[PDB]
Structures are given as structure tokens and as C-alpha cells.
Design a protein around this nucleic acid. Structure first.
Length: 978
RNA sequence: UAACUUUACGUUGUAGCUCCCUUUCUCGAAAGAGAACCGUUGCUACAAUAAGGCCGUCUGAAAAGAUGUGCCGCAACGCUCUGCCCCUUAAAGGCUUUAAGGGGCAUCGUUUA
């Protein structure tokens, strides 16, 4: 869009310039051609610009010069942040200094002599900003040229032409206004009238700081506590007084010195206390701005008002040009101060809260209240969930995921009525930056390889171990090494030669699972089987009371456990219920938003007042393991439903039953399941096979599935009923008729009667495969052999071989790029039918049947724009010209958009799945398998299905839930445009 | 994250000058010197820069002229409108139509000028 607008406005400016030339006489009225372009305009405007200082030009030469000035009107400043814009500005300043200092009067003459001498070319190439000019220099040049040509006797130096041309060369539309840019972000959620704050604001920075200070609590070895009011008061003003408040500086200020660690701080990482915990960017930016020119007392506080600081920050963030900011803070700041700020300050970044709202909010956070509480401090339920508010969900991935979850919810409600409760489990990856998720993938694979090394070591130590070691076994061995070979509950030495003889050393939960629901790696110790049998539902404090507990604490303190584990192991007094609830729920932003939104805006026949649960991922995995749902060996997208069952069975009653069982088991049978053969029933329902077992055949159909359920669960009466249908994964369709019209690079279309095109290929990109197809390898063999040998010497490195300039027996004119022929049997006409480009992506495929043969007519997006419903259907190898013309002898069946469900019955077999691609060189189609099972095709995609000679080729419809799978019959062929 | 103002390239097409060079002329005992079509190297200029579609103002009955810090076009979401498809019910001639109602998707709507 911005590229379109730029080219449009440039062409419009040049057109207006030509109209102004014609109106005020010069190039009187007939130098123009059929469509207003100047005929035989000279091709030496740089030279004429340089010689315009010394000579009356000519109507034509003068016109060409000014059109050249308008076309290349240089850079305007509109001040030092980026790499590339920084480099362009550096080059601009270099040329400005050179023009004002050396023996040069204007850009034209300096450009001619200096640039042709130093390089042999004027205009920039490929990215270089050496020859770039600022608009100021060119405006001075235009004024000087008008003066000089008034001296030299040019009939056209009229005041009209001067005013018009100055306006044409200098004018640009304003960048976005304050009110419009503010409207871009939503209005405040606490003060509806007001806009969302800028980040670089005293109030906003203070809110961030107060949030950080209030949420940082000190973990003392064997307790929790937040910084006392004296500590907060100590730290409160330090970000302003110092440049940055290092965590180590805060530790010195509070003098913890040892055995007291900060909570909410990764203490495993070495020198963690060197973190740059907080820096007030706006305050110090303003102070440095004033200091750097003499308006600021260097080591004493910034005297600008806090309110005034909010205003200054917002002002500098709301205007993007010297003029606008000058107006705003010309009202609001003293001229020297405003000038100093305008000379160096750069702002950005809004903060999604109202400065008015934050003014009231910040006293609560500042004194030391909690983050969430302050918001509270300060009824339309419907059957179908309303759309997800895009304002509160500021993330495209999260918004699309929530929208499809809403579609699922609404479809479920239509089919089966209002639910009693809705339980939710959202992935960790939801709501993470692409950077964050990339780092997470990196760490996950790192951990995979670390566990692979650990497994190899387990194999070396235990050669006779049955198969490959699971997770608990590797944990056993590493805990053995971490505990000095001594069981932590008794201190008796342990063998390690056994370790896997059943009932010898066990993994006990230090804090009892029944009271904490915690089975992390911080709460699991390796104890001996004999001494573990008498612990009960006791904590380590509650079991060994005393110097015995002191010996136990000495052992735990003398272990290679991380600090977190040692602290957790040795706690006596905590809020049990709080911990069991916290390990049971997920408190991320997405889950809280969904739980509040669904509860508020949807009717549920709930038991009462909460009826929305955000399951913690860990406990869902735990319940899956404990309910017999082994982590499958499957590509299936189907596993998502499996988890969905577990989260749906995770209710308060089931939780309390599990807690009762665990409490019984620790003080000395089936792990409680929701009902008998739950595992087997859910597995058959999800995978259509006795659990897992990819060797079995799948129950594709209702008959097969119900008979399988009644055979392998004859005991279970209600396992079969009127709703049990095979799972079919539903792919959101994509019937969009718009999109990229063609590929981006434009090619020469002259030699297209024979299938070919020509492209200027740089030598830096020129490879031996490309080089083998140069147009003039035959007609310039000297050049061919030279390039071949030179490039060969550098082992097919284009940039390395042709980094050295490539050129009578001496060197002749250089080469930067050579023309290379490329294959072109089809294309799209572009740039005024002066170029060809490759087809982009088919937006539709129309299917015809005639005499038990199928014909696929492809429809691309450029055809939709031009509005030409195509004639010809594909034929295997023939170029587009020799294709099957469609007429009334053919029967139209259906149109295929990507991700439409299709059925291809052929002689070999029957294929069912979502249409994905239709290769145009073969007339075959690819279809994604509905669950993307990797055992099928290549990653779940059947490639090269030939439908020309199929028996049946039909298209189906399917809804959100995967129901209502029926063939659809299209009456008339639909058009491309309306 | 959605939203800006501009610059400067690159690509193609066309013009001038230019580096090579394939064939065909003319010369000349060779070597070549100049040519013609085309290819194409480099420098400069102009046009276009999605494929496609529009408006505002001024003079005119209109046709058209003149004219402009002119506008949209690869997305997301939605169902108020419109279109295709699917379903339920009622009425009239498992087939067809109609109406109401409920959906899915978009060539429809909003952000959006």
C-alpha cells in the first residue's frame, strides 16, 4: 500500500509539473505527444543543470532540468536511531559538507565531476547512499538556478512559475496527526474519553516501577516475604538518582549479603544480581538532553514538573516533525528548553492506559499496594458467545485462536444446548513473541539432546536394562548422584547397582502430594524403600520434629540440590490450600481473560458462581498419564481432543477423590478414574483403534466404530449411543478470492513465441547453473569462457568470483550484470504490457465432467481482477495455448477453493481429504489428510492424485465440529467478480 | 501487532551515446576498415512499478476540456446489508417452489480514505 501511494504521488507530482510548464508558457503547447508526455526531451539533464548556471538553456532543456529536479527532490529530515536510515543520513551530511566547503556551487556540478571521477556513475546503485542529496541543497539549487536564468535572460522566470515549482518541490502531506494516531490505539478502558498513554511518561514509568517493586519479594531460606515499607522507600527514588539501578546495587542498598535471595529472580544463573532491574528512560533522556547543552545541573534532580514531564513526553511522542512539536511545546515549554529537547529526544511506545486513570491508580501502587487489587479499588448474558473483542486481545495469533475457539463453542451450543461448565487448557506457545517461541524451541531441543546424552549414560551404567530408560529412571540416577549416594530420609548408603529392582529406592514427594498437588523436580527426593514406609501425610518438619531434623537439614544443605529444591524441601508452615490451588490453575493472561469473558457473556447451567476453569498444563499432563492415556506415537492432530477430554473431566469432585486416594496411599489398587475402561473408551473414540496400536485398521465409519466399541467394551453399557461418530478433524476453509496477483520480479517478454524470457542477473547472484543459460554464451564466447574460468576458480561463489571487477588486449568497459534467459511457458502481463511475471497462486479450480473424464480449469487472482472466467482446462504436458477449451458439452460439477473437502474414488483406492494444491504441469491435485497422519503421504499430504481418469470426484461440506459431512451440488458455474 | 510522511534503489519498456560481438554487404594478395538487422555491455533520461478500478473542483446543455498536498486494490475480524451453499419448520404443487427461522463461507460488511 505504501509503495503504491508513493509511486502514485510521484507520478502525480510530475504530471502537475508538466501541466504547470504548459500553463505558464514554456514548452509552449505542442511539444507533447498523444498522451501528454514531452516529445524528444533531452537526455542530459545533469549536464544541463551544471551548465544552467552559465547559459540560457532552451524551452526543452530548461523543462528537462526542472522535471529532473522534481523527480529527484532529495531527502528531508522530518534524529539518529537506525542503521540504514542512519547510513543514508551520514552520506547526505557528507555530501552537504562537500558542497558547502569545496570548490562546488551546487549538487549538479559537484555530482558530475566528483562522481564521474570517483566512480563513473551518478545515480546510486544496489543500496549505496553515497550520491544521495538532502532536499535543502536542491531547494537552494533551484532558487539559484532561477536567479541565474533571470540574469541570463530566460523568458520563463515568471513569479507564477517560481511559486508553483517551489511548492511542487517542497510540499509533502503531513505525517499522521495527534488525534488520528491517538485514535489508532483504543480509548482507555478506565476513562473511556481518554487515550492510551505513551510509555515515555513520568506517570507510566512510575507505574512500571511500582509494579516491579511491589511484585519483587525476598525469598529467605525457609520463608517468603516482600520488601518492607522501609526497603521500598529506600529503593523508591534510586532509578531517578542513578543512571540504572542494578540488582547488585539494590542488594548493597538493602545489605542482604547472604542466605537471603530475591524471589522472582533466576539465582541459578551466575552473577544474576548484575541485572539492569530498572532504568527510567524518559527522566534520564530529558536530563541528558538538557545537560548536553548547558541547561541542566549535572548531578542534581530534574526540576521540570511531574505533570509537565507527562505533557512533554506525550508531546514528543505525538508529533513526528519539528513544526508540530514546536507548536505544542512552544505553548508548553520555554524556548531554550524546548529547542534543547527538540535537538535530541526520540520517543515511541504507547502503554494501553489513560494518564488520567494512572494519576489515580499510581498512589495505590506507589505506597505499596498490589497490582491487580488497585484496579478493583478504582450484565448481558446470551446463549451464544459474542465475538472476541479485538481491543483487549492485541495479538493476531491469540485473536485467531480465540475466534476459532468461539466458533467451536457456538457450534457445540447450537447442536447440544448450553453447557453446564466450560474447562479450558491453553498451550504455552499462545501469547508469545515469535522471538520468545523461537527461543523456547531452541531450549526444548537442547533439553532433548541433554536427555539423550543422559540416556546413553544410563545405558552404559545399566547394560541389561530392559529397552530404553524412561523419565523416572533417569531422574532416579541423577538424584542418586545429587544426593552423594545416600538416601535422604535415613542417610543409609544406597547401592546404585540395583536401583531398578522394584521397591528398592523410591521417589518420594517431600511435601505430600495430597496436601500440595506438587510433583515438580523441586519436590521429589530419592529415599530408601524401607525407611519411606513410615512417613504418612507429613512434611519433613512434621516427621522429624531437634538435632535429628538438624542432621536432616545438614544432609539437604550438603547436597547438590539447587537452591529452590533445598528451600522447598525444608518448609514447615505454608498455606496448603493456596499451594494446591496454585499448582492446579494457570494464571496467564489468555486464560484469565477467557475465564472472565465466557463467565460474563455466556449463559451456563452451572452448579454455581464460577463454572469456568483454567487448567494448569502440568496437572492436565499428570491426569492424562494417571488415567492411562499414554503419550502417543502419532502425527495426529487428534491428540488435541484427547487432552480436551481430560480437562473436561477435571472437576472439583474428581480432584477431591484423587486427593483422598493419594492421602490413603501415602499412609498405606486403582488410581481413581472417571469411570471403568475410561482409557480404552476415550482411545477408541479418538483414534478409532484399540488404544494407540497403529497396526490395527481404523474404524472409519459409525458401523465399524460402534461394533468395535461393543466388542472391546462389552462390559460398558453407555459407551455406545446416538452421538458416537468417528472423529474427523475440521480444517477452517480459505475461500478468499483475493491476493498477490503475480510474482514480484518482472521479465522481458520479447522472445515469448518460443517459450523464454530474459532477466538482468547481477554477477553477485550469477551461479554456474544460471551461467550455463546466459543468452550470449554462444555469441560472446570470450566472455563466456572468461566468466566460466573465473567463477570456477572460486568454487561457484558468485560474489567472490565477481567481487573483482570483470571487464585492444587491455581492459574494456566493466560488467555489473548480464542478461540470462529463463523458461516461460505462461505468465501475467505487467508494467503496461511491457513485461511478464510468473503466476502467483491459484485462487480457484473449476471442475467439469464430460464422458467420465474430469477437467480442471485453474483460476488465478489476476484473472479475478481482470474478470476473465477462464476458458481452458489443463492437459498434462501441453503449454497453456494447447489446452481443452471448455464449452457446453462439459458438465460443471463444483469449484474448489484451497482447504475444501474432496473425495477422489479411483480404480486403485478411495482418497478423502482437504484439497491443498493443484499442480498445473500435471493436472493432478494434492490433498491434506484430515489429521495429517505422517504415515500417510509425505507429512499427511497425498501428492499427485490424478483426477482426469478417476471414477468419482466429488466435493463435500463440513462444519466447525466435523459433522454434517455431505456432498454438495452446485447449480451454475459461479463467476469471478460480482 | 494494527496505522503514517518521504527518500534512494532494483525490474521492465522506450530514446541518445557506448563495450563487445553472430551472420550478410562492400573493400583489400592477409590483417582488417566501414556498414545492415539483431543480440547485447555500460552511463544518462522518461514511462510503468501489482494484475485492476475510481472521485472531487472549475467552464460547458451536454460532449469533453481545465484541474488536484486527489482516492482504493495481496490483511484481520464479523454477519447489519448483498451473494453462494447447508439445515429446520409451515404452506402449495422422497422432487419443486415459497415463506419464516437458524447457520457456514465469501466475490458481502467494518477498520477504510
Amino acid at each position: 500500500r505504501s509503495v503504491r501511494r508513493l509511486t502514485r504521488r510521484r507520478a502525480h507530482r510530475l504530471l502537475r509539473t508538466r501541466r504547470l510548464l504548459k500553463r505558464e508558457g514554456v514548452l509552449q503547447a505542442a511539444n507533447f505527444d498523444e498522451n501528454g508526455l514531452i516529445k524528444s526531451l533531452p537526455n542530459t539533464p545533469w549536464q544541463l543543470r551544471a551548465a544552467a548556471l552559465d547559459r540560457k538553456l532552451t524551452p526543452l532543456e530548461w523543462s528537462a532540468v526542472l522535471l529532473h529536479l522534481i523527480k529527484h527532490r532529495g531527502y528531508l529530515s522530518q534524529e539518529t536511531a537506525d542503521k540504514e536510515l542512519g547510513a543514508l543520513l551520514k552520506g547526505v551530511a557528507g555530501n552537504a559538507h562537500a558542497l558547502q566547503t569545496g570548490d562546488f556551487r551546487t549538487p549538479a556540478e559537484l555530482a558530475l565531476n566528483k562522481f564521474e571521477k570517483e566512480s563513473g556513475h551518478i545515480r546510486n546503485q544496489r543500496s549505496d547512499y553515497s550520491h544521495t542529496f538532502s532536499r535543502k541543497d536542491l531547494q537552494a539549487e533551484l532558487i539559484l538556478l532561477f536567479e541565474k536564468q533571470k540574469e541570463f535572460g530566460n523568458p520563463h522566470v515568471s513569479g507564477g512559475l517560481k511559486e508553483g515549482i517551489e511548492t511542487l518541490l517542497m510540499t509533502q502531506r503531513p505525517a499522521l496527526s495527534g488525534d488520528a494516531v491517538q485514535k489508532m490505539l483504543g480509548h482507555c478502558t478506565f476513562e473511556p474519553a481518554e487515550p492510551k498513554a505513551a510509555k515515555n511518561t513520568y506517570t507510566a514509568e512510575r507505574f512500571i516501577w511500582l509494579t516491579k517493586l511491589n511484585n519483587l519479594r525476598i525469598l529467605e531460606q525457609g520463608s517468603e516475604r516482600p520488601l518492607t515499607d522501609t526497603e521500598r522507600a529506600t529503593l523508591m527514588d534510586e532509578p531517578y538518582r542513578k543512571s540504572k539501578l542494578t540488582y547488585a546495587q539494590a542488594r548493597k542498598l538493602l545489605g542482604l549479603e547472604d542466605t537471603a535471595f530475591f524471589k522472582g529472580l533466576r539465582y541459578g544463573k551466575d552473577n544474576a544480581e548484575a541485572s539492569t532491574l530498572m532504568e527510567m528512560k524518559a527522566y534520564h533522556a530529558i536530563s541528558r538532553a538538557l545537560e548536553k547543552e548547558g541547561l541542566k545541573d549535572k548531578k542534581s534532580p530534574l526540576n521540570l514538573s511531574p505533570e509537565l514531564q507527562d505533557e512533554i513526553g506525550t508531546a514528543f511522542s505525538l508529533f513526528k516533525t519539528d513544526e508540530d512539536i514546536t507548536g505544542r511545546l512552544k505553548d508548553r515549554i520555554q524556548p531554550e528548553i524546548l529547542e534543547a529537547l527538540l535537538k535530541h529526544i526520540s520517543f515511541d511506545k504507547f502503554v494501553q492506559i489513560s494518564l488520567k486513570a494512572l494519576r489515580r491508580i499510581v498512589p495505590l501502587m506507589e505506597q505499596g499496594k498490589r497490582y491487580d487489587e488497585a484496579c478493583a479499588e478504582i450484565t448481558e448474558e446470551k446463549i451464544y458467545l459474542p465475538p472476541i473483542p479485538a481491543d483487549e486481545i492485541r495479538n493476531p495469533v491469540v485473536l485467531r485462536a480465540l475466534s476459532q475457539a468461539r466458533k467451536v463453542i457456538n457450534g457445540v451450543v447450537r447442536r447440544y444446548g448450553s453447557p453446564a461448565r466450560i474447562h479450558i487448557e491453553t498451550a504455552r506457545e499462545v501469547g508469545k513473541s515469535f522471538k520468545d517461541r523461537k527461543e523456547i524451541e531452541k531450549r526444548q531441543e537442547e533439553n532433548r539432546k541433554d536427555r539423550e546424552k543422559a540416556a546413553a549414560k544410563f545405558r552404559e551404567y545399566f547394560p541389561n536394562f530392559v529397552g530404553e530408560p524412561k523419565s523416572k529412571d533417569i531422574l532416579k540416577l541423577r538424584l542418586y548422584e545429587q544426593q552423594h549416594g545416600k538416601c535422604l530420609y535415613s542417610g543409609k548408603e544406597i547401592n546404585l547397582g540395583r536401583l531398578n529392582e522394584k521397591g528398592y529406592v523410591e521417589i518420594d514427594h517431600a511435601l505430600p502430594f495430597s496436601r500440595t498437588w506438587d510433583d515438580s523436580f523441586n519436590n521429589k527426593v530419592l529415599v530408601l524403600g524401607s525407611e519411606n514406609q513410615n512417613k504418612g501425610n507429613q512434611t519433613p518438619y512434621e516427621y522429624f520434629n531437634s538435632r535429628e531434623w538438624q542432621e536432616f537439614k545438614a544432609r539437604v544443605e550438603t547436597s547438590r540440590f539447587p537452591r529452590s529444591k533445598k528451600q522447598r524441601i525444608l518448609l514447615q508452615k505454608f498455606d496448603e490450600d493456596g499451594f494446591k490451588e496454585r499448582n492446579l490453575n494457570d494464571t496467564r493472561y489468555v486464560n484469565r481473560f477467557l475465564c472472565q469473558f465466557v463467565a460474563d457473556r455466556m449463559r451456563l447451567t452451572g452448579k454455581g458462581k464460577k463454572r469456568v476453569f483454567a487448567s494448569n498444563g502440568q496437572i492436565t499432563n499428570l491426569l492424562r498419564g494417571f488415567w492411562g492415556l499414554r503419550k502417543v506415537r502419532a502425527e495426529n492432530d487428534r491428540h488435541h481432543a484427547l487432552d480436551a477430554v481430560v480437562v473436561a473431566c477435571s472437576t472439583v469432585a474428581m480432584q477431591q477423590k484423587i486427593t483422598r486416594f493419594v492421602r490413603y496411599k501415602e499412609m498405606n489398587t486403582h488410581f481413581p478414574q472417571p469411570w471403568e475402561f475410561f482409557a480404552q473408551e476415550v482411545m477408541i473414540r479418538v483414534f478409532g483403534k484399540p488404544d494407540g496400536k497403529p497396526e490395527f485398521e481404523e474404524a472409519d465409519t459409525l458401523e465399524k466404530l460402534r461394533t468395535l466399541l461393543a466388542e472391546k467394551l462389552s462390559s460398558r453399557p453407555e459407551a455406545v449411543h446416538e452421538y458416537v461418530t468417528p472423529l474427523f478433524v475440521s480444517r477452517a476453509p480459505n475461500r478468499k478470492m483475493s491476493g498477490q496477483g503475480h510474482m514480484e520480479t518482472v521479465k522481458s517478454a520479447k522472445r515469448l513465441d518460443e517459450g523464454v524470457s530474459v532477466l538482468r542477473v547481477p554477477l553477485t547472484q550469477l551461479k554456474l547453473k544460471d551461467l550455463e543459460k546466459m543468452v550470449n554464451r554462444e555469441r560472446e564466447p570470450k566472455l563466456y569462457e572468461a566468466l566460466k574460468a573465473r567463477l570456477e576458480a572460486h568454487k561457484d561463489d558468485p560474489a567472490k568470483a565477481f567481487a573483482e571487477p570483470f571487464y585492444a588486449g587491455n581492459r574494456t568497459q566493466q560488467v555489473k550484470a548480464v542478461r540470462v534467459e529463463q523458461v516461460q511457458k505462461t505468465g501475467v502481463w505487467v508494467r503496461n504490457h511491457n513485461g511478464i511475471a510468473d503466476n502467483a497462486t491459484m485462487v480457484r479450480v473449476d471442475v467439469f465432467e464430460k464422458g467420465d473424464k474430469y477437467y480442471l480449469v485453474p483460476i488465478y487472482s489476476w484473472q479475478v481482477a481482470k474478470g476473465i472466467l477462464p476458458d481452458r482446462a489443463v492437459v498434462q504436458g501441453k503449454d497453456e495455448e494447447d489446452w481443452q477449451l471448455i464449452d457446453d458439452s462439459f458438465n460443471f460439477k463444483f469449484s474448489l477453493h484451497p482447504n475444501d473437502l474432496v473425495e477422489v474414488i479411483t480404480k486403485k483406492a478411495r482418497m478423502f481429504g482437504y484439497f491443498a494444491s493443484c499442480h498445473r504441469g500435471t493436472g493432478n491435485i494434492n490433498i491434506r489428510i484430515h489429521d495429517l497422519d505422517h504415515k500417510i503421504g509425505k507429512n499427511g499430504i497425498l501428492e499427485g492424485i490424478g483426477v482426469k481418469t478417476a471414477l468419482s470426484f466429488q466435493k463435500y461440506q463440513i462444519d466447525e465440529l466435523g459433522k454434517e459431512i455431505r456432498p454438495c451440488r452446485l447449480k451454475k458455474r459461479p463467476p469471478v467478480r460480482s
